[model samples]
Target: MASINLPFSLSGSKRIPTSEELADGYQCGPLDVELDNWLMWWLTGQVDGVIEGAGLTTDDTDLARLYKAIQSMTSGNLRTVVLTAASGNLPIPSDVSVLNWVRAVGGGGAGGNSNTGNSKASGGGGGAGFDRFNVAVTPGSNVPYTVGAAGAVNGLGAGYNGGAGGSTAILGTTAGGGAGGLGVNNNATAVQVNGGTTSGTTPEISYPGGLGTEGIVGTGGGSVLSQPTQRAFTNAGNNNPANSWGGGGPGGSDFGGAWQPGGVGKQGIIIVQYFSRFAP
Candidate 1:
């Protein structure tokens, strides 16, 4: 049989004499002590079963006392919820003692509106910012949550920048809003002035919104799930809207005389996850 090393083992510690060098001529002298450790190991498993079954494995003193002392046992189960657009409220589960694993994101900024006179394409809006963390709250209490709104659509023929997005908040967690897109003539550079500033409240993890890029103008900024394809030079007078959450609106390209309105920014979202404890 293969060698087995049980706890408090001295099986391999002592050397035994062979038949040629036998003193007392004991047949199984070394085997007897090794079996004692195995006996103890088997007994421990049986006794420890009682403590393990009660979920009190850590207690080393007074096993019977600890098992009797534990009056209540609680366990957690995973749960989650998601919200998007405008303000609303999130319900804390009645079984939830701690509202941990919360996340918040702000709305995306609007793209710049291309004027009738400008030859350049409009600048895309900035992507939304985000925040995440965990916190304790009273069970069965409701936490008011506010979702950020996307930027306002730009006016036609004005060649002005669209409005910035609204910020977001849940419980005490907050997040910054996406910045407005810049006008065509106002900028000579590419990809600048979107969102990169952190305005969110205390969070275990957080980051500001991404910046908008400039193409001959640019396409939309970053998003949680939204993606924007840059409009080609030939594809002027076209504007693309951000449809997904936290996506920046795509700018309209100008074909000399063609003037298109700015794209609308996408709405932001909030997600919550928690472990609700239950007694057994």
Candidate 2:
């Protein structure tokens, strides 16, 4: 058989091998070197283009579907959206296929107060409620969320009176707000939302609250504060009754038998996290 001629030279020999050449038949076929090089460049470029366009990486191999792989590309990735009292409808991203977590806090309660300056004492302010859970949401769907307002204060010397906190909601789940502290001369007791043991402030999530302080001013209530919750959960809006998230406020005190008013409650918060397939 005639030896095959080729454009590119072989490492060991000057000419290309032929089909009948038994030695390492790998190099048996060849010919147009420039054309082969150009095709290789073009073909490899297309592969790279597909990977880039699909938001995939070299490591994302054996993927059944680009969507599913993209999902795992950012399996633990997170996208956060905060909703306040004024915020209306929040829309989910089209690419967001999974929900990592949702956390919602109820409004804080108001503080208590007294009228006369006759050695009266006021109750402490209420705390905010907190709820955290996992949940799934439809893509491009709008999620309605509302932040709770602080409790209100009114009347003469109402400054000494503790107000209640508002409630917060996300999706459809809800959690309640903390109760206002007791008022004047009466045994001032902190009213907390119902759920969980002393260890946890809410029902499902284990939010914790601090104790009250002594003296004239009211103590601080627990505040859930805010952070990105994990995925696959739905935190109810009104499940928590304790001020574990944001603690209650201090009580009212006075000089020379004068009873002061209580402090105000904190507002509520809503946090949601979405997963991604690629890096942001």
Candidate 3:
């Protein structure tokens, strides 16, 4: 009987023992050779061009290529990317798919200052609001995103208000910054300022920032990332600044019974979590 043949002639031997021929005396050499040849052909056939039909490409040996082909073709895993304020276009990565969720935050508001009339205290600053929302995006497309700016400190003096924090958004999903607090004048009464407020629009998860608290000198409000700024010092002209993500700044206290300046609010951040066809 003629021997069966398989491709990938390793050792120039693709012959296989025919079952009828095998019945004479179950031969082993040709069977083993056939198995080796068949394996070689199948392995090399599994990758590169054949797998390219499925949009997968690899540069490795036959066995390894099979592994990589399936690896890249399967649904990718979820990962995250952190971003800050940017004035340029951001690309939706080609390998990326669903933006499972995006965590957005607004800038915090600056604290208000006390009057220069002397013997006065100020109110603390407010924190920024945050939200986790889902956004649809096209692969390989350029998208716009804005990171909110932290509130600016103002030294208007004589009971002046500081700058409010900035707003942030990712493809229109937004977060709001807190408002600035006002300082107390020569009045014996302590001043209390309004805190920052976030967007009321629905999100996957949403929460408002911390509200401004009453003034000892002045105290910072709550933010997700870090601790609130401490009260300002009595050493005139000393400023109490916020140092956390979305944290509020505290107002300044008069030291030498002179003029004082307000503190600046903390900065905000944006994070987009997504699934990608490949790890970047």
Candidate 4:
């Protein structure tokens, strides 16, 4: 064959290799010099603009998706997100009756006599119980809440009877706090039956009297102190004086006898849940 020398230059020619050349052809790998340089810039944040904007941070991952992506976005605690996230995914429960139990106990009656000596033995008053229920919570803002107030003391020498607890609702008008027990006074039992009320028309709640302490033979003041024979002292409210169960207060006393002032009632508790539909 005749030699055919073309007008190709070494710097600009495309070469065709033999089979041996094919086996040793140039290769590309993960650690290429160009790739390594790019990776270094990314790690050092020289390319921060690409990953993070002016105001963005690693925390921005949460609000970016608007889907609550991070499982523990609120805190390291799993439940902190699980409860809200799972609740977000799951349909609201059909029975969405958020239950809250709070006892608005009427204040206990003050001791029979404020004087140090020559104190007369007098009976204590009863406590009250108030409960309110709502359809659903509004979540963050404009949330509605009701809190009860402590009972009041009348004055010195003249048996300082405790005032009834107060609530977000009115007494009998909506949900009234139970009336506390009075000294030697049975005419005021109804005073403690203050009902729970609401802004709606008609009554939607029931305010029950607390158990009474023992008085004379057939007398029981509050559910907590329902008894007779006016011991050296008497329980003043609906709660049990012996065990101190429930929210009612304890009884008043004379000469610091079997009774002292009633214990304060406990605060309320709220439970919330989502529902699928409202049931009739």
Rank by lDDT (best first): 3, 1, 2, 4
Q: Model 2: per-residue lDDT, tens digit, 1-280?
A: 2221222322423333344443433344576454445445555555444444345553334444355344444554455776765358767766665565576666555445543444333333333344555565777766777766665554355333456556565665555555555455533333323211122233355353333333343344555662211111111211122243344544444444343454454566777776544443
Alpha carbon lDDT of each predicted model = 0.59, 0.47, 0.62, 0.31
Candidate 1, clashing residue pairs? 191-213, 191-214, 215-218
Poorest 10 consecutive residues by lDDT, candidate 4: 78-87
**Can you write out model 1's per-residue Cα lDDT over 29-74, one digit (the tens) per residue?**
4556544455465555555543343444434444453543233122
Q: CA shift at 40, candidate 4, in angstroms?
A: 40
Q: What is the per-residue lDDT of model 4 for residues 135-217, given as tens digits with 9 covering 90 to 100?
A: 33332332333334433444332344544444333222222333444443222221222222233223334334443443222
Top TM-score prediction, candidate number? 3
TM-score of model 2 vs. true structure = 0.54
Better of 1 and 3 by lDDT: 3
TM-score leaderboard ranking: 3, 1, 2, 4
| Residue-pair clashes per candidate | 3, 61, 6, 44
lDDT of 3 by residue, 94-199 (tens): 7554565677766777766665554444444555545565567778865677787877777645567777777776765667777777656664445566555555
Error of 4 at 178 (Å): 1.6
